[PDB]
Design a protein around this nucleic acid. Sequence first.
RNA 1: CAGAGUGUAGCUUAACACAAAGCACCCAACUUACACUUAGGAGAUUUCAACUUAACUUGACCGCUCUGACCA
Lengths: 150, 120, 228, 35, 102, 137
Amino acid sequence: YKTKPTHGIGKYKHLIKANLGTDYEYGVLNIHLTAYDMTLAESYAQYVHNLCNSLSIKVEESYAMPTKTIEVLQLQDQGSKMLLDSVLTTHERVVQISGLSATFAEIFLEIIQSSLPEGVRLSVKEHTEEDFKGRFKARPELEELLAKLK
Amino acid sequence: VARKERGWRTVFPSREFWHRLRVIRTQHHVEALVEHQNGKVVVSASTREWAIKKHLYSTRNVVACESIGRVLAQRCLEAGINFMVYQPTPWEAASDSMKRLQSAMTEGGVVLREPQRIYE
Amino acid sequence: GSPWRLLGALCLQRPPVVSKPLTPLQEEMASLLQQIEIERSLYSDHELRALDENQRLAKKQDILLAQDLEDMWEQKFLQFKLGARITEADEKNDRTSLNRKLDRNLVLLVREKFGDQDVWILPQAEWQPGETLRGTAERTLATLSENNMEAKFLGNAPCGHYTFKFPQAMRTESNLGAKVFFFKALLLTGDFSQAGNKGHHVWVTKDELGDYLKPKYLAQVRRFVSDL
Amino acid sequence: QAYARLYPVLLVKQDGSTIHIRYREPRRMLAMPID
Amino acid sequence: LDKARERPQVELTFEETERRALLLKKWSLYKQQERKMERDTIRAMLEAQQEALEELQLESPKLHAEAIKRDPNLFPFEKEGPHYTPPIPNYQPPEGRYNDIT
Amino acid sequence: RRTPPLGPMPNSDIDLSNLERLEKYRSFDRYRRRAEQEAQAPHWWRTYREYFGEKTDPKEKIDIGLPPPKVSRTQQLLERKQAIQELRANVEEERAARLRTASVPLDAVRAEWERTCGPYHKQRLAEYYGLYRDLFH
RNA sequence: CAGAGUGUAGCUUAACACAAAGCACCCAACUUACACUUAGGAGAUUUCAACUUAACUUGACCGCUCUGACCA
């Protein structure tokens, strides 16, 4: 009851929550792990996903893009005709990271470069101007947002 | 004929029993406990006790679960308790170790279905 | 201002160009990983042709057989040559050239004459107003004797510090001593000239870094350098 | 769940560097050509 | 989709199963020290990083303002993995062409 | 009209400024563990145990038993830690553990319990049966 | 090298004894991945003595922290 001293004991939604960087930390950072071996690409992506969770930094989402394959033509000996030699496929693994401090930036970068596996490429970049944020949104999120603008 | 604690249909687990079996699975030990509704515990079979440690390889395996299952079966038989109740979560009920632990109750003579209270 | 003089330092680091040697336990990794492959994988087209060729021969138009294609491809193996992981520097222990200890990391050290005695230390530079410590690190690279390299710079915060006091020789009220801050850097490409090699710089690993560094200086250094 | 038999093969890069890679064919050596 | 692709299942010998569990039981601990040597080396530099920051804090406040400051020139970075063998300085492969399939 | 609480709120200790920074339960079992560890804790409001749970007098139960036997914990621990070391050493014992086919002698382990934990379990069970409340008052 | 402080695997005001406990932590299975879940393995009282339980009370020894000494 409101009058009784035990008022509000059932309150539960106050513990439940109802990109531009700061001047000390970064807004959003994405890493790209390209490789011609799918197993190595996802294994390292899983490795960095587990390690970044250990370091207690927020992760936005990890997804996949359509995989691009490239073929190789080889010049025939004593000739001038291009002939099919091999077909390769590059697999890109991306994990979105937001909220990485400037001081911890050097430590984070030195780890994944020191633990970089064979034949895979890493890259660190912002990827912020293309953040269209057009994600499908669920029903309860719409109701609170619609009540906010109403 | 004793009345059972009916109700609590909105929370888990229900309390319509006289004696309940509770199995606790920690990182290093698995604890099988049998207790009354009111809170008093009648008999227990934990891997911490030195009696079964000398004969078991590990305290956190299916072999350990069978070890305390037969121990609890013999303890319940010699304590006079024959009927009991078990209310597990879906995942632990689907665990292979638990089912063989229930098999220990069957071969030990322990039934996990309390008889219905006779109202009239 | 203060009796503790300030210096900026750079620790040049070159990552290994080749992977570290595999522990024999990791040999059992790939051996089983391939072993769980063919036990779970299905027939490849190479095996499909091989089975069909064998079946038809037993019953009895492919000029090239699957076994034959293996032979020529294996024959081509004896034709080409792979790069040698162990180089001439490894045999000679050339602690100045790039081709020594390709499996592990390397860190540069330079000779400096302080207190009438040469001390193996990292490059250093005095701090000046209006310039960041990273600018001192860039200036430190420029001050190197006949150097031409580019260094990848990560972060801005220092990677460590080391405080040493004067041995009661120059120690004064205005100047008690000097402290130095290390900053990590990544070496992409570049090399020194051949005019001075032995008396200019040395490149070593973390394991043997203790032979050249002072025990106090090494202790501070080992707290941020790795052997991965 | 469904994949072919990947043999241990090798790729030679533009500068001559070699890396490990899995391929459908038993072509354990490969050097990509100059474009 | 062809069922002729299916390979027969070879019986796994009992002794071979023994060495599987033995290497599995050692793989778990081997990776544990691999994480153990990882967890100490991050904190080793982390404490060494903070003491350098606090020592520079007493040295000069203005330097600290530009020390923790974000460097905008960072993060175009790219790093490629090592190779089995060092590249050959003199190696010219024959001509060729590439194509893209989407 | 409002009245200040007579004691600390159940969720007052948790900071709400960094609620997203705080780690979550992320599982049903972890919340359940916290649920019934906190359920048995005393509270200043009306609880189920206040009306239904049996009440015990503030005086400690009087013990009229023999003085407890004295054993050397260090020596006992050393024998116990070496006993399972050789037990884990045998491959045959390890083979049975991994195959989930090992068994233990029920008669032998019961005899050991009668000397180690027998007196305590019997006292605990006898208290449940009401022997100590009816006789000995 | 000296003067103070400290000691259970990472943490714990865990350890009455019946007993060195709980969590965190690592591997495999699911998953692009995380996470949940299932199945696994790794762990500690620094060492010697004190009528004796004694990680627990007292010493010595050993290992760490701080301050002086040494200092390129």
